[PDB]
Amino acid sequence: NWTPEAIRGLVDQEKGLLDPRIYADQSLYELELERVFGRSWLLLGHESHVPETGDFLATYMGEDPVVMVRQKDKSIKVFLNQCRHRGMRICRSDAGNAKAFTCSYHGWAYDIAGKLVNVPFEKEAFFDKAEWGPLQARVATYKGLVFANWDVQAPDLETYLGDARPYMDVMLDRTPAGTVAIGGMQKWVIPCNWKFAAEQFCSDMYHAGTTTHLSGILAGIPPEMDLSQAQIPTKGNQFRAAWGGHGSGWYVDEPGSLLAVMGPKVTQYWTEGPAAELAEQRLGHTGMPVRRMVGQHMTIFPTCSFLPAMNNIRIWHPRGPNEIEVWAFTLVDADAPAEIKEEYRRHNIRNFSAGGVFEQDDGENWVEIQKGLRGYKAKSQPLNAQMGLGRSQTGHPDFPGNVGYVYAEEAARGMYHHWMRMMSEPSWATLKP
Amino acid sequence: NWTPEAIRGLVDQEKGLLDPRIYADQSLYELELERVFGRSWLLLGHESHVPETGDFLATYMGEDPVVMVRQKDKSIKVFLNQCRHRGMRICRSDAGNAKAFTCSYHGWAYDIAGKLVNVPFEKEAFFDKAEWGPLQARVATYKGLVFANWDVQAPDLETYLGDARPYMDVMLDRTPAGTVAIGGMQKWVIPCNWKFAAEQFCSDMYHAGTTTHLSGILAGIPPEMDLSQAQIPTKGNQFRAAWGGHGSGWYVDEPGSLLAVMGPKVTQYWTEGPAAELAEQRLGHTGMPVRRMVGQHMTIFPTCSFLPAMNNIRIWHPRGPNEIEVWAFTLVDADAPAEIKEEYRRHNIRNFSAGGVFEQDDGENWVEIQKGLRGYKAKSQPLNAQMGLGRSQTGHPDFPGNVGYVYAEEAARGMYHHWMRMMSEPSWATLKP
Amino acid sequence: NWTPEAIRGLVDQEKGLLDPRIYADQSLYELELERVFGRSWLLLGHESHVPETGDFLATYMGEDPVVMVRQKDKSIKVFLNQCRHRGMRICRSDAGNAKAFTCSYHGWAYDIAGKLVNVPFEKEAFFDKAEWGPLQARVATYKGLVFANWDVQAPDLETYLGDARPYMDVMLDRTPAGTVAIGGMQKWVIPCNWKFAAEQFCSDMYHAGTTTHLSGILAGIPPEMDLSQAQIPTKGNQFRAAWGGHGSGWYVDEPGSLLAVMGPKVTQYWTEGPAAELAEQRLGHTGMPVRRMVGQHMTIFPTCSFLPAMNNIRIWHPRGPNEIEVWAFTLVDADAPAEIKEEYRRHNIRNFSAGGVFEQDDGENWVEIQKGLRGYKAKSQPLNAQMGLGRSQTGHPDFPGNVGYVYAEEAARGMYHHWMRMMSEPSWATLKP
Amino acid sequence: FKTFEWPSKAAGLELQNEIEQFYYREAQLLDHRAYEAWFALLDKDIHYFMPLRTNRMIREGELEYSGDQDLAHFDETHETMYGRIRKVTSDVGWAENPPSRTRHLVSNVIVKETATPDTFEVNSAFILYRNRLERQVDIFAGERRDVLRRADNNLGFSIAKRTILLDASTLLSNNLSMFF
Amino acid sequence: FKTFEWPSKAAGLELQNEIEQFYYREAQLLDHRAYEAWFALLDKDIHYFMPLRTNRMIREGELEYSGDQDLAHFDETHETMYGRIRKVTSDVGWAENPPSRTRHLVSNVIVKETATPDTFEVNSAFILYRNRLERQVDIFAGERRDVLRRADNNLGFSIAKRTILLDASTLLSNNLSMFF
Amino acid sequence: FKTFEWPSKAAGLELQNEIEQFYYREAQLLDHRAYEAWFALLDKDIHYFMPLRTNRMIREGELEYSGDQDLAHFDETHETMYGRIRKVTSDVGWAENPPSRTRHLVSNVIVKETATPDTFEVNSAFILYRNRLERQVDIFAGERRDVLRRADNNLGFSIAKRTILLDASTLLSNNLSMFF
Ligand SMILES: Clc1cccc(Cl)c1-c1ccccc1
Ligand SMILES: Clc1cccc(Cl)c1-c1ccccc1
Ligand SMILES: Clc1cccc(Cl)c1-c1ccccc1
Numbered sequence A, B, C: 001n002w003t004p005e006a007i008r009g010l011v012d013q014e015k016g017l018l019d020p021r022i023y024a025d026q027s028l029y030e031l032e033l034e035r036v037f038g039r040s041w042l043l044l045g046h047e048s049h050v051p052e053t054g055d056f057l058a059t060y061m062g063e064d065p066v067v068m069v070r071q072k073d074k075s076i077k078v079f080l081n082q083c084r085h086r087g088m089r090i091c092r093s094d095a096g097n098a099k100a101f102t103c104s105y106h107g108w109a110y111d112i113a114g115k116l117v118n119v120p121f122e123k124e125a126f127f128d129k130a131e132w133g134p135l136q137a138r139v140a141t142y143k144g145l146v147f148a149n150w151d152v153q154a155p156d157l158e159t160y161l162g163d164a165r166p167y168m169d170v171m172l173d174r175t176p177a178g179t180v181a182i183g184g185m186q187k188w189v190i191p192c193n194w195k196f197a198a199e200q201f202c203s204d205m206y207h208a209g210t211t212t213h214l215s216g217i218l219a220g221i222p223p224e225m226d227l228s229q230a231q232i233p234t235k236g237n238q239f240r241a242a243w244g245g246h247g248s249g250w251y252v253d254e255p256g257s258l259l260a261v262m263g264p265k266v267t268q269y270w271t272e273g274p275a276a277e278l279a280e281q282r283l284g285h286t287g288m289p290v291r292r293m294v295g296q297h298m299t300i301f302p303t304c305s306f307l308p309a310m311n312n313i314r315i316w317h318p319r320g321p322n323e324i325e326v327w328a329f330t331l332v333d334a335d336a337p338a339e340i341k342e343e344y345r346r347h348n349i350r351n352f353s354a355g356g357v358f359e360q361d362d363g364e365n366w367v368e369i370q371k372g373l374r375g376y377k378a379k380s381q382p383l384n385a386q387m388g389l390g391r392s393q394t395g396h397p398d399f400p401g402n403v404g405y406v407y408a409e410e411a412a413r414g415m416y417h418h419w420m421r422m423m424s425e426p427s428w429a430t431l432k433p
Numbered sequence D, E, F: 001f002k003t004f005e006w007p008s009k010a011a012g013l014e015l016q017n018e019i020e021q022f023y024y025r026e027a028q029l030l031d032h033r034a035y036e037a038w039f040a041l042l043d044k045d046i047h048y049f050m051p052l053r054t055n056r057m058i059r060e061g062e063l064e065y066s067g068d069q070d071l072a073h074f075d076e077t078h079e080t081m082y083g084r085i086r087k088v089t090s091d092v093g094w095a096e097n098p099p100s101r102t103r104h105l106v107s108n109v110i111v112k113e114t115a116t117p118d119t120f121e122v123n124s125a126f127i128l129y130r131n132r133l134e135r136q137v138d139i140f141a142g143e144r145r146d147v148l149r150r151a152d153n154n155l156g157f158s159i160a161k162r163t164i165l166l167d168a169s170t171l172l173s174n175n176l177s178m179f180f
């Protein structure tokens, strides 16, 4: 048993200290499924994954399989992919179009809303069907992205997102046409804890600007150029959300990393011309000079991560303390030129799939970290999250909210600090913004 | 901790509700091994598996490997397959004939009764060998079948079986010559809880009359006939044992199911002619119209299941909450014509092997169910076992015991009720019938 | 919970009884990592594995990855192969030479002593580097062999070894030139508890004098000779250390088994001629007639095993209660003839690697034992450790320390007794010699 | 089932090639779920057999495989194979709806003549890799002993007999919903 | 991606042999990390492709694979393949330094002529066994559909196109740091 | 151990077929436990070698394999293989009594001539699948580098030298109770 006291002591944001047991302990894992995944807003995909009536995506909330499905009234319904009779999976494929769903075990039939409409031999054997359909999640959409939450007490999505939204709009709100998902969702398995993946995208430009991605960068520069010429960006900022453990980081004015990653046509599109002007115009209300932002990472706590200029998105599905699945897709402006959509597609494949020249080095690190945490002494001393400690300020002229340097772990400490709060505060009365 | 109070709360036969944690909880599993498998009568096989002196079969009682061996005095002994010196497996092959057993590790030698008869270097290094043989189980036969129980305080097998016996005798007591096992014991692994398997065969005709086995039936009907023409059986009954969690269900008068599974020759043998009338005569003391019973499923709690018309028998070997091994064989009447024996062999392979047109779809269902149970929300709400609630009664003119309709869960509720009883009552003083 | 009293009950050296749960219990295992591996002297290898400045070996202490590295001043350091920033492996290959070590995740650079010497962006984001390097182990040497211990309160190596040292010298101190390791370390995985393996090499000549290795001997005798004529020694002795759970056993005079294992050239080298005479000269003061010792097994508790005349050395790395890794290497006298060195290499490969004609049969036995222990009844009765009970003596006329017969379990009882003590006594005030 | 009794003179280069290509084509049909096209290969008198395999002491090695009057994993005729093809192509056939993804890697093809013209006895090795749903992987390895007759079809041969010797005692898979 | 449309008349023995041998040589380059020599085999107009694969009800089976407009596991040109070769031979390419140990087992080779003389469409099956670090094992199975052109190099052919059909939906490996 | 130096001009069809058929026959002997017949294939001067393999950084790539003066998994002469054959065929050889079930899938055969007539240097790839007892499965991949001599025996050739390069560092099996 884990006391709330014992839990509060796992993360110290004032000293910048993290207890390594957070990444490996089985008991904390099972508590996370209740206290974190059981009541957070989790990303399921984009509206365009399910555009027409009956279109469905089978996905996860924690280790709970769920079905995301468009309704006739254009609403999106999300219910548990589990029959309340004997637990069978109702929707048994990845995606498609359904007129209804039928349990393959005993024939209990559901409408596309997840409502139990038929039970074979009901008169001869029975009970209200309106109470025996699968558990529904709350569904909210933020500019295309579809989110779900089990907990009726949890704040609404917008309140939950708070002052993180400006940095989501950088990617999501550049045109009145909105975003669309390029077809296809890549899925793969990494034997590490979800928090390493979530933290890296929340807070860790450090690893991309140091050693992890030297070879990724090398793959992306011209053949004639070598690493000794590689343009190091050191200008940038980091955002920690007012509430919720969200965080983002980005480079400023230095297109070195974006150009290597996304090529010249995407970099020019993101920074110069009609689309880039309109985006800055559309985002003027936040005051941000979005065209000076060249390469950004972000996490919406716990497990929604994305790279704005590059438009790669990922959902981390936890599979115990020692495993995750990565489900990845990419977005483009719905009204982007064919040539640009094609650039985003090819470079997202080249850099960020399981074969990606960036992704490869990420998983290699995470895998060894987790293996180390099997050791007793490897868990006996805190890890260092002291970088940038006491250096952030809520009054930056360019960027809103709690802002520090690009190489910092203020967003990180915020993430672990909020993880700790969700783990130690049973009741939303205290937990809410 | 799992207190009796808490254990009592996992099953509710009054309201017909099941806590799905019973299928997934590791702690409950460890208790099951002690409280259920440690003290139930478990099927090890048939007498004809070990026909001659020294003939043995290596099998399991839960996760304890045991040896079942024919003795010199024609009795059968079952002992733990584990040397009390340092734990080595005494009998290392699946089956065969032995004059003796010798531990491969330090040469401790055993007769075919499990008795420790030789310890190498005993005089130089030592203690009474008579106290150091492997643990022996109680062994009882019921009409050809060999059951074992570790617990000297448990009821005897006849009492344990109680009013389930008439329904066993439909399969086992049809001829004065008895039954014999077809050679061959199939073994395969399913990643699901043992209770899903035991309940299906205890109580779940419903799944075979709805969706699970539609393609199974399709595979067995004439090439010219399609699914629509397959007559739908809806006539039949279900039995719940007075004591012990045993249950059975069968179709009455409508032979369509049996015809597709076993074909016309076996269907004929079971229902028309001399052998069929001899069966009804031998069982007249029950008053059951056996020739009208056409397709039957039964579980003798916990893990002994069979299908009396088709003579398929299975033992479920638990392997943690998330896995079983299935070990399967088939029985024929010993004096049945050779032609009928061949038919029984062929259609058991075709239907109930790991590649079986029926079996295939059971494992597919169970696999996805257990997978769902990894989720937090998936274990948070009860499962519905309300079918036939209140509708069973003890006075049926044709079939004795607590009897209701074929599509019901009275047998299922009884099984989980008894499971609950063994899990929460340490003493046989309160537990016995 | 595992209280001291409960832990004391698991092992009874007076009666010679072992509770089989010690090999299977997950909770006991995790305590082991803390109370046994966390404060024992663990074999990491031989000095010649890291002969020159910056030579390293990536190894383990329990499940903690460590780096063993030669320093300019000729001392050897051992540190946790884990970066304190976010846990990454600092040294990512098996062995080689290093000028420094750099973390692949964020570029924290370390010198060959494991001192944190450069943090990228330290000036602009930060804390004292001297306090943030990997945890350091105490390192001690005994006649070539490198041990490490985390615990600063533990006894020093010599005191830890006590009167086991003369039995080690039989292999390690035969020449003023010392020993050298042959190149290469074999590594393989066995799904069994480490204690089976440690005990076998501590106390178990019995298994080689009975049944385990009948086919190993058969592989090493002349083709003209068959098993019935093989010379099975029955003469020898067993040592139990005064403190620490160390043990050894050996054959006396009868060179039959050594000849079958090592061939005639090695047997003669060990027993007759100038080299054997020098060894007798060097070691005689310890009271040992080394030239009569013809095949010996030893364990330094917990996981350092070796076979003095065959010079096969092994490290058992725990991987949970149900698995180990075996890391094997072989030693030779540095000044031995080239021919004898070659013979040591050939015969160690032939006998003692994962394909070894001896090693094959040990894994085979252990795999089955551990599998058996998944059973509930398999863990419910004590195992027999009564061999040689009250037959050992401390004033033996030919051998020093506490000495009994070769086929005894006195050295095993001592091993499990010390194990019990390490697991129940948390202070070195009570535990120390 | 002893070692395959290969002929001392190996089949000519063209026959060897013809039979290897037949298997390669068969694997393409199976790995692309062309179940009716594959079933057309089966002769009306096909015996399609996969015996049980057990752990025996050397002394009792003759009892390793299940016999003709014993249970087996498969023991099929043309009529029963048809029922299975009807099931595997069925919308209600859950075990293969959604379908698995399989790979039949075929090698070690040894060709042998029979007493009958254009009828061959063939030995080969295989690995069947089956991937199912999100994360299920079942690996099978074994040998096939076929009787093949030349035939005027897109593959050049038809299957008269097939026995599969699978390297497994207890099946590690939850089912055998695939074809060997 | 249906059954490979193999030609009625089999390839000549010499042609069959040459292409199998090409593949064996290619496997040796890859398994021995001769990345420079392997890249030399890629023609300038190379399209190297590995589509995503999904679970679909039979009635929606046509949606199994991703198209040219969707994401993929690989979708490469000579230029981007170059970058990958630069990374995999790089001291700071962590995913392959230390390098992995791989085996490309190649079989089921079916050769088909095209409208271009000395250009061939080739189908083949593989198992790629990848072992890495201490204990990591990833096993892949699938088929490759190549366009090969006759070339004056040490291998005999160049690769104009490669499509790899992997038997997987969710990849069970943490990455694809290997070449197919 | 660099890339196999295959000859520019490939072995002829007949020679290619003979050596492949040799391996398929050798694999059948092994997989059906014909240990005495298998052992007869080994010449008096056999060297049978399986080096250790370690994780190294690219700069230390030349140290990947153990050497002649190092430990190995196997390093055998005719006399030592003889003792291994007596153990594996012995009733009291527990590791293989009960025997395992193995499959040696052979492919990727490259044939290279030597200075000596009727003596060939041969490269090939394998997957060895080992199933044992109730549930144990050990999968091995690698390559073989053989020196074969034409021989007047049942199989066509005798084995003069065998080096096995296993794609493994730490062995994931509990033993190597099989032959490669
Ligand atoms: Cl790896 C990288 C390259 C270029 C731009 C960015 Cl934001 C990144 C990046 C930084 C931290 C986490 C994930 C991705
Ligand atoms: Cl699947 C089936 C077909 C025909 C007749 C029966 Cl009793 C069954 C059957 C019903 C419940 C459990 C197992 C099998
Ligand atoms: Cl197996 C053997 C043969 C000859 C001499 C000895 Cl000490 C042994 C031996 C005895 C116990 C453990 C390991 C090895």
Ligand code: FES
Binding pocket: A083, A084, A085, A086, A087, A088, A103, A104, A105, A106, A107, A108
């Ligand atoms: S599980 Fe869905 S109907 Fe029974």
Ligand code: FES
Binding pocket: B083, B084, B085, B086, B087, B088, B103, B104, B105, B106, B107, B108
């Ligand atoms: S374990 Fe059976 S004699 Fe030692």
Ligand code: FES
Binding pocket: C083, C084, C085, C086, C087, C088, C103, C104, C105, C106, C107, C108
């Ligand atoms: S983990 Fe080593 S530098 Fe970040």
Ligand SMILES: [Fe+2]
Binding pocket: A207, A208, A212, A213, A358, A362
């Ligand atoms: Fe990264």
Ligand SMILES: [Fe+2]
Binding pocket: B200, B207, B208, B212, B213, B358, B362
């Ligand atoms: Fe069923």
Ligand SMILES: [Fe+2]
Binding pocket: C207, C208, C212, C213, C358, C362
């Ligand atoms: Fe041994």
